[PDB]
Assembly symmetry: C3
Homo-oligomer: 112 residues x 3
Amino acid sequence: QLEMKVEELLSKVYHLENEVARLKKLITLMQANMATKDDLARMATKDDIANMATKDDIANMATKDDIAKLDVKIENLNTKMKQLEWKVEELLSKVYHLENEVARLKKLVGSG
Amino acid sequence: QLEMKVEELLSKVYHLENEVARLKKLITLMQANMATKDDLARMATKDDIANMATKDDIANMATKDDIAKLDVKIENLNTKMKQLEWKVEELLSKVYHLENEVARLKKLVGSG
Amino acid sequence: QLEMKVEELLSKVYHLENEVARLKKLITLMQANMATKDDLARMATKDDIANMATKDDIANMATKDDIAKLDVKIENLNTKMKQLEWKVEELLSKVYHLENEVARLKKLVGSG
C-alpha cells in the first residue's frame, strides 16, 4: 500500500523529469529563434516611412541637365537678338542720312 | 513518519505537475505571439532607409511638363526672331537701292 | 530499502522544484525581452520600401526656382524682341516714304 504509493511517485517523478527536460529543449529552440526588443530597435517603423517619396513620385522629375539645355537655347537667342539689333542700328543710321540727302535734293530741285 | 514523508511527496508532486502544466500553457502562448528571426529578415532596417528621400525633399521639384512649357516659349521666340530677321533683310535691300538712286540723283543735280 | 527510495524521491523532487523555478525565471526574462507579432505589425517591411526613392535619385533634381529663373530670362527676351519690332516698324515706314520722295525726284529730274 505505502509501497504502491512510492512506486506511483517514482513513475510520476521520472515523467516530470522528462517533461522538464523537454520544456528546456523547447525554450532553447525559442531563444535561438526569438526576435528581441533590441532587434526591434534596429528596424524601421511604418511611421518612419510615412513621408517616404517613391520612384513613381519622381517619374516626371526634371533635371539640372534639362535646365542647362534650355539655358543654352536662351543664350543663343540672346546672341541672335543682339546681332539683329546691330544691323537695325546700322540701318537707322543709313535711313537718317538718306533723309538728309533727300531733303537737300528737294531744296535744289523745288518744283522741277 | 515514513507515511508523513510520502504524503508530503504526493502533495509536492501534484503541485509540480500543475506548475509544469501552467509553464506549458505559457510557452504556448509565447510561441503563438513571438516574432522570429525569419520575421526580422522580412523587415526594413533603419539602415535600409538612411538614404530615403522624403515628400518634403521633392516639394519644389520641377517636372518634365515645366521644361516642355518653357521650350514652347523658346520655339515661339525663335520664330518671331526669324520673322524680324526677314523684314530687316528686305529693308537692308531697300536701303541699298535707295542709296544707289540718291547717288545717281546727286550726280545729275550737282550744285543745282 | 523503502526508506532509501523515499529519500531518493525527496531529493529528486527538491531538484525538480528548483529546475521549475529556474525555468520560470528564464521565461520571465524571455517575455520581457521578446518582440511580439504586434511589434512586427508596427514595422516597415522590405516590400514597403521596394519603391523607395533615394537622395541619390534626386541629386540632380531641377527645382521650381530653376524654372522661374528661366522664365524671367524668356520674358526679358520677349520685351527686347518687341522693342526691336517697334524700331523696325518705324524704319519700314521711313523707307516707304523715302521711296516715294525718290520717285518724285526721279520724275522731276529725268535724265538731267
